[PDB]
Amino acid sequence: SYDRAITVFSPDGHLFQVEYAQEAVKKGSTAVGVRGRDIVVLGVEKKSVAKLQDERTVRKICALDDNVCMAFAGLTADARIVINRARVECQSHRLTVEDPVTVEYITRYIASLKQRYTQSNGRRPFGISALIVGFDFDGTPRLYQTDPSGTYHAWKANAIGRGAKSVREFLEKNYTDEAIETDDLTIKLVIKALLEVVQSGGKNIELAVMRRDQSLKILNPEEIEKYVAEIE
Amino acid sequence: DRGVNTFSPEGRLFQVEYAIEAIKLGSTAIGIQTSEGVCLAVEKRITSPLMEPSSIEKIVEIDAHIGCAMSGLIADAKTLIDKARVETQNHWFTYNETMTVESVTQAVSNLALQFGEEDADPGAMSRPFGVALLFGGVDEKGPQLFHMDPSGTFVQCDARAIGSASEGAQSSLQEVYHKSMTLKEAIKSSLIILKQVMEEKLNATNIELATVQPGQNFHMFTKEELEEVIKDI
Amino acid sequence: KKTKGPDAASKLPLVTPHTQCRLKLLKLERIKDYLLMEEEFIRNQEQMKPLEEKQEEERSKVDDLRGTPMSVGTLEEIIDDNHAIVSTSVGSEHYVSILSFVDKDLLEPGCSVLLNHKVHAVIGVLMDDTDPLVTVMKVEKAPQETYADIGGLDNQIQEIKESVELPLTHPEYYEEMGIKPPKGVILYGPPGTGKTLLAKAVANQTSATFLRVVGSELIQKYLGDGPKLVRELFRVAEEHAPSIVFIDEIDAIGTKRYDSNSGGEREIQRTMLELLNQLDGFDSRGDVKVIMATNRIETLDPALIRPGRIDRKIEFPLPDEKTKKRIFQIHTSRMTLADDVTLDDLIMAKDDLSGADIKAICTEAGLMALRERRMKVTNEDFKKSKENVLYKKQEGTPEGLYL
Amino acid sequence: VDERPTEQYSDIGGLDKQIQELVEAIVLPMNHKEKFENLGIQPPKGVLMYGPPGTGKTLLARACAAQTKATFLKLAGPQLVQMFIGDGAKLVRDAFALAKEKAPSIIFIDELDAIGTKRFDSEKAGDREVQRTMLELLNQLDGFQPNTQVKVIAATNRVDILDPALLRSGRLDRKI
Amino acid sequence: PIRALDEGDIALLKTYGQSTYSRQIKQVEDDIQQLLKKINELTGIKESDTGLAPPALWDLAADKQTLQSEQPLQVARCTKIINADSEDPKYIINVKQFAKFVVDLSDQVAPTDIEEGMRVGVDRNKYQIHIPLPPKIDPTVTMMQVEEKPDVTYSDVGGCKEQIEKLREVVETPLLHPERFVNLGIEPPKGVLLFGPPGTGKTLCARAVANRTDACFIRVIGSELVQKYVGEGARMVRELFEMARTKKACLIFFDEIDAIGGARFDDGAGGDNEVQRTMLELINQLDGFDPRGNIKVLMATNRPDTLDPALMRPGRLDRKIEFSLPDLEGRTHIFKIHARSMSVERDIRFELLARLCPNSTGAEIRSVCTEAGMFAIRARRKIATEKDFLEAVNKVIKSYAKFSATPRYMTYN
Ligand SMILES: Nc1ncnc2c1ncn2[C@@H]1O[C@H](COP(=O)(O)OP(=O)(O)OP(=O)(O)O)[C@@H](O)[C@H]1O
Ligand SMILES: Nc1ncnc2c1ncn2[C@@H]1O[C@H](COP(=O)(O)OP(=O)(O)OP(=O)(O)O)[C@@H](O)[C@H]1O
Numbered sequence A: 001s002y003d004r005a006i007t008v009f010s011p012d013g014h015l016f017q018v019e020y021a022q023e024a025v026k027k028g029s030t031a032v033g034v035r036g037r038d039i040v041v042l043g044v045e046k047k048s049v050a051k052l053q054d055e056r057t058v059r060k061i062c063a064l065d066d067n068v069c070m071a072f073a074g075l076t077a078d079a080r081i082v083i084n085r086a087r088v089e090c091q092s093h094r095l096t097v098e099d100p101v102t103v104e105y106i107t108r109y110i111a112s113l114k115q116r117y118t119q120s121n122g123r124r125p126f127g128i129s130a131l132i133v134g135f136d137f138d139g140t141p142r143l144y145q146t147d148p149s150g151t152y153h154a155w156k157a158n159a160i161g162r163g164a165k166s167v168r169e170f171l172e173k174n175y176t177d178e179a180i181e182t183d184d185l186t187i188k189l190v191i192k193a194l195l196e197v198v199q200s201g202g203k204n205i206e207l208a209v210m211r212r213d214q215s216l217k218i219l220n221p222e223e224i225e226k227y228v229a230e231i232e
Numbered sequence B: 001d002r003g004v005n006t007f008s009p010e011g012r013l014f015q016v017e018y019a020i021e022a023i024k025l026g027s028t029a030i031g032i033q034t035s036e037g038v039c040l041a042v043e044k045r046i047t048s049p050l051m052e053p054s055s056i057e058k059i060v061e062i063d064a065h066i067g068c069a070m071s072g073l074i075a076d077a078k079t080l081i082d083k084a085r086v087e088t089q090n091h092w093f094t095y096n097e098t099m100t101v102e103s104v105t106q107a108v109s110n111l112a113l114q115f116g117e118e119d120a121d122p123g124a125m126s127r128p129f130g131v132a133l134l135f136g137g138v139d140e141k142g143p144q145l146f147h148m149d150p151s152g153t154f155v156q157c158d159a160r161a162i163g164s165a166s167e168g169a170q171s172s173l174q175e176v177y178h179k180s181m182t183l184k185e186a187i188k189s190s191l192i193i194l195k196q197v198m199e200e201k202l203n204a205t206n207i208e209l210a211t212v213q214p215g216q217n218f219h220m221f222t223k224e225e226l227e228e229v230i231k232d233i
Numbered sequence C: 001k002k003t004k005g006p007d008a009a010s011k012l013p014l015v016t017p018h019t020q021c022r023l024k025l026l027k028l029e030r031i032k033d034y035l036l037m038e039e040e041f042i043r044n045q046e047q048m049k050p051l052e053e054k055q056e057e058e059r060s061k062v063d064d065l066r067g068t069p070m071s072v073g074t075l076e077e078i079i080d081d082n083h084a085i086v087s088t089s090v091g092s093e094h095y096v097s098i099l100s101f102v103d104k105d106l107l108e109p110g111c112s113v114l115l116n117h118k119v120h121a122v123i124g125v126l127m128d129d130t131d132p133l134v135t136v137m138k139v140e141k142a143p144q145e146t147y148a149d150i151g152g153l154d155n156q157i158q159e160i161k162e163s164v165e166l167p168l169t170h171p172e173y174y175e176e177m178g179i180k181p182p183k184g185v186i187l188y189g190p191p192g193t194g195k196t197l198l199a200k201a202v203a204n205q206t207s208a209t210f211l212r213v214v215g216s217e218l219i220q221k222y223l224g225d226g227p228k229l230v231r232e233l234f235r236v237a238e239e240h241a242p243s244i245v246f247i248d249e250i251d252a253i254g255t256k257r258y259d260s261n262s263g264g265e266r267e268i269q270r271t272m273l274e275l276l277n278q279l280d281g282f283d284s285r286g287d288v289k290v291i292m293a294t295n296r297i298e299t300l301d302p303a304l305i306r307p308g309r310i311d312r313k314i315e316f317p318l319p320d321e322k323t324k325k326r327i328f329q330i331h332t333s334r335m336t337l338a339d340d341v342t343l344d345d346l347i348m349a350k351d352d353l354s355g356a357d358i359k360a361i362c363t364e365a366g367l368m369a370l371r372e373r374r375m376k377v378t379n380e381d382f383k384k385s386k387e388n389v390l391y392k393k394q395e396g397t398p399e400g401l402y403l
Numbered sequence D: 001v002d003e004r005p006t007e008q009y010s011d012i013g014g015l016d017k018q019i020q021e022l023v024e025a026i027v028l029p030m031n032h033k034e035k036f037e038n039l040g041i042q043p044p045k046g047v048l049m050y051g052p053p054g055t056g057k058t059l060l061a062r063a064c065a066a067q068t069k070a071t072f073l074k075l076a077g078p079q080l081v082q083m084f085i086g087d088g089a090k091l092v093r094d095a096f097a098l099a100k101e102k103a104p105s106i107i108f109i110d111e112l113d114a115i116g117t118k119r120f121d122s123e124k125a126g127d128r129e130v131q132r133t134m135l136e137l138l139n140q141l142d143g144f145q146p147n148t149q150v151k152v153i154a155a156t157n158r159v160d161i162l163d164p165a166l167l168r169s170g171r172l173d174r175k176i
Numbered sequence E: 001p002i003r004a005l006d007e008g009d010i011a012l013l014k015t016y017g018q019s020t021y022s023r024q025i026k027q028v029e030d031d032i033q034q035l036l037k038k039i040n041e042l043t044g045i046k047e048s049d050t051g052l053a054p055p056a057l058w059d060l061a062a063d064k065q066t067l068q069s070e071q072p073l074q075v076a077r078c079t080k081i082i083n084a085d086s087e088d089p090k091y092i093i094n095v096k097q098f099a100k101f102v103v104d105l106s107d108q109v110a111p112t113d114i115e116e117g118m119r120v121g122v123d124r125n126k127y128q129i130h131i132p133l134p135p136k137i138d139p140t141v142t143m144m145q146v147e148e149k150p151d152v153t154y155s156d157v158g159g160c161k162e163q164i165e166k167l168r169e170v171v172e173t174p175l176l177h178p179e180r181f182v183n184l185g186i187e188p189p190k191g192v193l194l195f196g197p198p199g200t201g202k203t204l205c206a207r208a209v210a211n212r213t214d215a216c217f218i219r220v221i222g223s224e225l226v227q228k229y230v231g232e233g234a235r236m237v238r239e240l241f242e243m244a245r246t247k248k249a250c251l252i253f254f255d256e257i258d259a260i261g262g263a264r265f266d267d268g269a270g271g272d273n274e275v276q277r278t279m280l281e282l283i284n285q286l287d288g289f290d291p292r293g294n295i296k297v298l299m300a301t302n303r304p305d306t307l308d309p310a311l312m313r314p315g316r317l318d319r320k321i322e323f324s325l326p327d328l329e330g331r332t333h334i335f336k337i338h339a340r341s342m343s344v345e346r347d348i349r350f351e352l353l354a355r356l357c358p359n360s361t362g363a364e365i366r367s368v369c370t371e372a373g374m375f376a377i378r379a380r381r382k383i384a385t386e387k388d389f390l391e392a393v394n395k396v397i398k399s400y401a402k403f404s405a406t407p408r409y410m411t412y413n
């Protein structure tokens, strides 16, 4: 059983392996999530459709539970693994607490999973940052971000991966209650933000929407094209 | 190369020294012990306006009479908090009493520095926790304030400030604190020092304040209360 | 005296319109007119004013007393009013007599002293001994560019202007607060992103005595000549009035010091040490400001980049979106573009496209045009240039690892 | 050495078991020369003080001085090298000279690591005069029979670089 | 399919395009280019043959008197004397680089006035001896004295009190008050080498000493210590120390001694050979069978690890002084010192900037105090503000010119 200390402090007070994993999260794709008044929207900018790849198996938005979904940015394989562990935990909590999980709870579990992978022996930090959205039992929309460092936070909106900060600055100046007044405005808000990073637009961003009662819905390419035209 | 458990020419562990250094990066936190009670304050250090300031919890409760303030690898603080709560409830379950602040800190400290690489455990901790806990609570002995450093060292203190502003926050605490200080006087003095060290103008949204008193349980001030104090301070 | 010897240039006040036009014709005609007027007047007044009673018989006497082939020698410990010691190029200590023509002042030890060939005698002082390998670094034909030629670098141009132009343009602005004007900016960035362009721009509106260096010509093959060429360079800089010395490609003499084992890699270290000592050491430094350009700021020894010697580290990055269109506008002007070759499209796509790439695409585009026997660039003539100029570049991560 | 310093073998520490080895290469063979021939054994006319930096070589050197009464002869590694070709040659020739003159004395060549370096050479050989100086010193040392009494001892802070010839047989042979 | 370009093709191409007045434009430009050359050629670089004192102040003597100076007063040649045969008028001299000789003493000079070792004025033709020459004082060696007082006092050297006291204990008190070192008989430590990260005031303190040295403060321009011809450097250092041992309480500063000193080796071109020889001469002079006297040495470096051991050991340099990064109080004092001449608003809290500038050095503290009012000048104000200073700190240090950790990076709370 390999039991070497992979991540260990360094002078001036830092954890290299945690930083390095963070950059790996950066080089990924750009993913944006915003919390509306009664809707939570996630989007992603696709590096390349490739004209042969079957778009079905390359989904970078998934549902941990009927009321929780997430988007990520980083090593794919690390992302698929983390999602499986979250999915099983969601069912386990349903089994014991007899109630649907809360976005805050599942975020703590996923965050606690990553925290256990930085400090552990003979392991590598997870190379993904995850954006978790969902509607709690009370109905209040929720948005959570988790970094590889294991720190998790609640946001009105934010962006990970390549083209994160610039997008967030765009979000910071352009986010407002008026922009979150209508569902369409929220959806268009997302698209413009990605367009701030992605070039082609309409055909290079995949969008998904979660409502209070309805489960996750992925916008059709026609719907994405229609919204892009409306913005223009 | 340079195993975690290594000794320097001075007899100093390398990892423990680094971890203590990392503490400085964390935000400020002020804890003052008074006969009327123990008060804690902290700087939230909001990264961005989008982030919800409610989800940055720098002051948690361990029991109805114990509170903690953190600074450092907040990700590392989580496991330390969980152990403290379990130990408190285990003590209540067995002895049908409330664990004293020193006992809880001693239990938490015993978790700090229990790390190794070879022949330790299938998944033991490899590295030291980089976080400095200010334990505050009321026990049979009255109000108690204990600071814990990453080295597993806990020592009751009358007034202390941890974080990036510790040096100078301590200095200010020196010029003002005195034995007969009341809780309100401690809270105000704590708020001023936090205001001085905080670059951003101090308002009601960027600072967490909590207090524990012999009568009341652990209490975390709400926005309405926080505004009232900073109004005069 | 500290003569503020300018670039001795600007003889082209600059024709305002660049499009072949009679306005250009008339203006350049005015330029020629004044130039011819000057030539005529100088020749005429040289011929006229019959001062032919010249030569100031007395100066003829002095020249007579100081014979033919005068020799250059180094003055040494001066003994008496009418006596001093000299050292010829062979390093032989003659004992000469200072004649009356020599001003007893201005003759200090170490000052090159003229001599009479036959009877070694200090005949006159020489205040121009600048190393013929150093005087070749004074720009005397100002490069033809203006801050408007460069584009898309506002923030990165204002920074240099606030330490190479304003401090001598409105120096009251600085003293009013007492902050000493920043001295020395290092322009570090990826290849082909400006750097030298901004250097030439600041050379143009100099108002000073620009000195150009290479970054390798300083290194010399004779032990010590290295760490004396730099000394001579900066001595000349301080002797002349306000100056800016551009030590381009400082990556050459800048490698991080190390406990070496060779000799050349120790002489180079000594050269860097001389540079550091003089730029910020026991001394001072008058109105001498140093501009350094490099491709790799991570290699420079921490020391030659310190916030007391090289402040205001500019960060010339790869051009951004709007800057790309600006540079295309500035580099496509003097071409007869067609009506469907608007450049608002060639931008984007590749995230790697520098200013050098832009100029290459613009030039191998006109060259492409001169292949269908046309002088009006075409959109195909531009779309066939991206596949011929931007190539051989490296690539990145394998798709799938990330999105 | 006109000043004739004032060191004595009680102002020096730990210098025993090597102080005596220097004694029987400096004082005894010069003071009482007869009893060395009494058997027929002569202490080689050279002792090299190889030892890590700042261990006390010059200390024992000035100790052998002062209490010598023999007009200690002093030199300097860097001083030997000179500008005009052969000036160092004259310096060394004379240095071993005026030693037969004022016959009673002992010469100490400090910083020997410089005047003599391992036999690297330049294809130009223009900067190889130091090698000529070192060969001259070696020749002088060779031309010396125990009948004459002018000892030579020198220190080298780094015995590594010394030319593995100055230690051959009859040149500096005893090591301390 | 790229067919070449024919001569007719080029000809037509040169003439189908808008050039109403363009041939004339090019011709006139060429005329201007050829006219500049004529203008400068006829106004070429003249009036540069200086070196002539104005034969007006001494105009009267600036005449046949000069010729009288010439002709008589034969120009002599310098030369030393290696012997003076007693009771035998013959002398032996070594001129300098030419050769040695045997010389007779001219009648005009009494033999007593001429001694062994003094410089004689031998004449050409037959090398006879004339008016002796005083001992030389080399120009390079004599061009090193401070001969001034740099405008830096101890007060301005903030942020380090222990360091300044340590330096003062060896550079000032042991010369300005020998009493304290006799009652205990403590030998004043001599030789202080200052370490420190690049830029901390290591040279600032050296300059500060020069303002109260009340003696010579020869500043070794290390670059001058190395010259082409062998032995030049050793002679340079020997003359340095010989002039040192000629006054009372001389202090010699070797700024950036890393240039002249380094680990010895014989691998690469036999090391530096000449440079190492100069280093060895310096070491011998500092310590050896020739007590130095009343001369002290201060040396500074960025990396002491690359110093030759025979020079780092005590004796040559005793009082090593770390110059570590300033503490909080040190930073506050440094800001206060490099802010007292700035038009800054009174309500500025300098105790906060100090915390916000961790692991910085004095040069950084300056570059922050400056470039702080620079933003004010950019805004066209006249009294900078605390916001300006804070923005300067964020744009100078901590984040300096590169801040990679930013995108969703808030793990330290
Ligand atoms: N933003 C820009 N605007 C205008 N011209 C530009 C721009 N960027 C590059 N160029 C042009 O690129 C050409 C290549 O030379 P340039 O001075 O730019 O190189 P550089 O950045 O100094 O290169 P090096 O890395 O080799 O020192 C110049 O003629 C310059 O005009
Ligand atoms: N063994 C020792 N006991 C006492 N003092 C010593 C000893 N060794 C050296 N010293 C002291 O060291 C001081 C400095 O010179 P030192 O004797 O160390 O030179 P060294 O070791 O001979 O030098 P180097 O070998 O580099 O020429 C002397 O004044 C001497 O008193």
Ligand SMILES: Nc1ncnc2c1ncn2[C@@H]1O[C@H](COP(=O)(O)OP(=O)(O)OP(=O)(O)O)[C@@H](O)[C@H]1O
Residues within 6 Å of the ligand: C280, C281, C308, E156, E157, E158, E159, E160, E197, E198, E199, E200, E201, E202, E203, E204, E205, E302, E326, E334, E337, E338, E361, E362, E363, E366
């Ligand atoms: N502690 C300090 N207090 C006040 N000023 C300081 C302090 N440290 C540095 N400075 C300032 O830093 C400026 C730059 O220092 P300088 O580079 O000349 O010397 P140094 O720090 O010794 O570095 P170097 O290694 O280049 O010799 C000085 O003008 C000085 O005023």
Ligand SMILES: [Mg+2]
Residues within 6 Å of the ligand: C211, C212, C213, C246, C248
């Ligand atoms: Mg140049």
Ligand SMILES: [Mg+2]
Residues within 6 Å of the ligand: none
């Ligand atoms: Mg050994």
Ligand SMILES: [Mg+2]
Residues within 6 Å of the ligand: C280, C281, C282, E202, E203, E255, E256, E300
């Ligand atoms: Mg210095």
